[PDB]
Nucleic acid binder design. Structure first.
Ligand SMILES: Nc1nc2c(ncn2[C@H]2C[C@H](O)[C@@H](COP(=O)(O)OP(=O)(O)[C@@H](Cl)P(=O)(O)O)O2)c(=O)[nH]1
Ligand SMILES: [Cl-]
Ligand SMILES: [Cl-]
Ligand SMILES: [Cl-]
Ligand SMILES: [Cl-]
Ligand SMILES: [Cl-]
Ligand SMILES: [Mg+2]
Ligand code: NA
Ligand code: NA
Ligand code: NA
Length: 326
DNA sequence: CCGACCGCGCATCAGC
DNA sequence: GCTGATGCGC
DNA sequence: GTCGG
């Protein structure tokens, strides 16, 4: 919150670019600047000071000067007053509606929650569930609830096959006191980079969690990735918990460290780390770290026995998950 | 000045 | 059906 | 929008 006004402004600008302008690189540029400014340990006194930080250039520096002088930004004030920009921005808040669908809906005269609810037949499955839990999905999850959810997921997974390992990642693993959703990394000895010896490894787990009425809805589901909706059980006479987003990712057991690095994030941290990898001549995904050849072709997976080995390859000092919240 | 900007799973669609 | 491109979200 | 080279 030290430079909260500035970071909020950059984030609003980032969202505009992504949702309305459909300019993903401007979106990332603003997110990068917000992130660097968020961790800067001084109250920013000028745009020039800000411009010293990597990711902050001339245009953002001017915006910071305007914001510091006036408490606001004219570019944003106008954006807020633009009905078409306002409408697209709102619609993209529904899970499943992105920039393209949002602008398409607006073209068709569909621009409010009421419009969505009366045109439910124009929504795909993902969009329908996003609309249904629109309110719920914007509520954060207290770590206490995350702990209860972890306990259910771990125990239920254990009931299916004691050889499964489920790990809660995302901001939870980075020690955050609240989370937007739950991310679960899943392994089982049967599924490795070499072989898949049992079918339905993910399916069985999803099934059990639906069976106990923990998972309530499915957004998408394939052999290795589940994205859906869950809900803690409530007690007698007590109000129901909000429905929550849950993602489950089944990763080859021998590829756990790359997978846990990936699912812990943050997403900006992963982008930064992967970009650094490239500068050092490596490429990182959720499975492997590979050297890049003298032309640019990914080579063979390098041996990895800890998250820190991955840091070591790219000559970064190790950062604990708590220090990855960029 | 100017490409390059992380990397990928699932749903959905166009074209054959 | 299939492949491949796009959207969306992670 | 920013940056490296
Ligand atoms: N490489 C990469 N990894 C990503 C990206 N987006 C997400 N991930 C990885 C890293 C993310 O950490 C992880 C989960 O994605 P959530 O969006 O749930 O992000 P968080 O859990 O961090 C928090 Cl926003 P919280 O949900 O508690 O509010 O997936 C991406 O664009 N690129
Ligand atoms: Cl762009
Ligand atoms: Cl403003
Ligand atoms: Cl690994
Ligand atoms: Cl790989
Ligand atoms: Cl930590
Ligand atoms: Mg999360
Ligand atoms: Na700078
Ligand atoms: Na959306
Ligand atoms: Na998630």
């Amino acid at each position: 919150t030290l430079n909260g006004g500035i970071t909020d402004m950059l984030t609003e600008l980032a969202n505009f670019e992504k949702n309305v302008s459909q300019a993903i690189h401007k979106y990332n540029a603003y997110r990068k600047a917000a992130s660097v400014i968020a961790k800067y340990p001084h109250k920013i006194k000028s745009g020039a000071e800000a411009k010293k930080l990597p990711g902050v250039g001339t245009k953002i520096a001017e915006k910071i000067d305007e914001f510091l002088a006036t408490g606001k930004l004219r570019k944003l004030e106008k954006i807020r007053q633009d009905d078409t920009s306002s409408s697209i921005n709102f619609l993209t808040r529904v899970s499943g509606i992105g920039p393209s669908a949002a602008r398409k809906f607006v073209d068709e005269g569909i621009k409010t929650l009421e419009d969505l609810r009366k045109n439910e037949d124009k929504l795909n499955h993902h969009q329908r569930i996003g609309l249904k839990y629109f309110g719920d999905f914007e509520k954060r999850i207290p770590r206490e609830e995350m702990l209860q959810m972890q306990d259910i997921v771990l125990n239920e997974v254990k009931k299916v096959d004691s050889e499964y390992i489920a790990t809660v990642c995302g901001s939870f693993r980075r020690g955050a006191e609240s989370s937007g959703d739950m991310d679960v990394l899943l392994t089982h000895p049967s599924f490795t980079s070499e072989s898949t010896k049992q079918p339905k490894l993910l399916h069985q787990v999803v099934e059990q969690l639906q069976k106990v009425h923990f998972i309530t809805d499915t957004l998408s589901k394939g052999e290795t990735k589940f994205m859906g909706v869950c809900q803690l059980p409530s007690k007698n006479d007590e109000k129901e918990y909000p429905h929550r987003r849950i993602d489950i990712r089944l990763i080859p057991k021998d590829q756990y460290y790359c997978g846990v690095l990936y699912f812990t994030g943050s997403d900006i941290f992963n982008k930064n780390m992967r970009a650094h990898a490239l500068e050092k001549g490596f490429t990182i995904n959720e499975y492997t770290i590979r050297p890049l050849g003298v032309t640019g072709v990914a080579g063979e997976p390098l041996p990895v026995d800890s998250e820190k080995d991955i840091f070591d390859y790219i000559q970064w000092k190790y950062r604990e998950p708590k220090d990855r919240s960029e």
